[PDB]
């Protein structure tokens, strides 16, 4: 059916904290010329 | 995982370990998608060549484990299985097409800081994120055999263009698969089969399981890339099951 809070990490997305390797992912999606 | 590093605490809380009851053996990884449900590969529950044809009682899963060696009581939890659902057109014989399966927990896990589910991809998020060069994160475990206890590992790997995938093997790959990993390093090794390949939406900021680890061609061999079951292609099936319980 559908989970409302899914994919929001209780210790990072909730907490407004970024991990040590997720910048790497975001800045691979920056290739959209 | 080969060529990875240490995960942080509650970094992959949807991470699951698929264990055997007797003898106790790490089979595969899996992904928590709801309270009652966990997602993994079909080859982890059924593979006649390796003499695998499990049932619910044969297996037991360990949710939210940071370190595999310990019994982290009141951080992790341990759960039984009520039913196992494998894809009806899971073709083990030829290519691991539709290498997908669902496990229903006997009791529901309560979500904590260390246990929390992952989002399943939808038509938009799939087309927008499932692109060549765009990277995704695979979590798994380094096996005990050789090697700070055995803490959850993690790697980030770029999706590869479809015709580099079709040239990188001799196996008829379907549209139900995509493939990822660096060119001429890193591939989720045995223990980490059936676990998630996730991507984060820059748009809505949630984490989304794009692929399940279906196979390597060996643990990290250059020119060869790991193949992942395309979760959105088969998203349709997952719903049919979870509706019908
Ligand atoms: C697997 O086990 C089931 C349940 O006993 C059995 O009916 C079936 O013949 C087996 N199939 C394979 C492919 O091993």
Numbering used by the authors:
A (entry chain A): 1E, 1D, 1C, 1B, 1A, 1 to 14, 14A, 14B, ...
B (entry chain B): 16 to 36, 36A, 37 to 60, 60A, 60B, 60C, 60D, 60E, ...
The paper states:
The crystal structure of the thrombin mutant D194A was solved in the free form at a resolution of 2.8 Å and final Rfree = 0.29. As expected, the D194A mutation abrogates the critical ionic interaction between the Oδ2 atom of D194 and the amino terminus of I16. The additional H-bond between the Oδ1 atom of D194 and the backbone N atom of G142 is also disrupted, forcing the entire 141–143 segment to undergo a conformational shift of more than 7 Å in the direction of the 70-loop in exosite I. A notable consequence of this shift is the loss of the H-bond between N143 and E192. The structure of D194A is peculiar because loss of the N143–E192 H-bond is not accompanied by disruption of the architecture of the oxyanion hole. A compensatory H-bond with G43 stabilizes the conformation of G193. The new interaction causes the entire 189–195 segment to shift in the direction of the strand housing G43, and by using the C191–C220 disulfide bond as a hinge, the 215–217 segment is pulled into the active site toward D189 in the primary specificity pocket. Notably, the depth of the primary specificity pocket as measured by the distance between the Oγ atom of the catalytic S195 and the Oδ1 atom of D189 shrinks by 1.6 Å. A less extensive perturbation of the Na+ binding site is observed in the structure of the D194A mutant where a significant portion of the electron density of the 186-loop is missing, as in many zymogen structures. The D194A mutant cleaves procoagulant (fibrinogen), prothrombotic (PAR1) and anticoagulant (protein C) substrates with kcat/Km values that are several thousand times slower than those of wild-type. In contrast, the mutant D194A features significantly different rate constants at the reference temperature, especially koff, that translate in an equilibrium dissociation constant for FPR binding of 4.9 ± 0.5 μM.
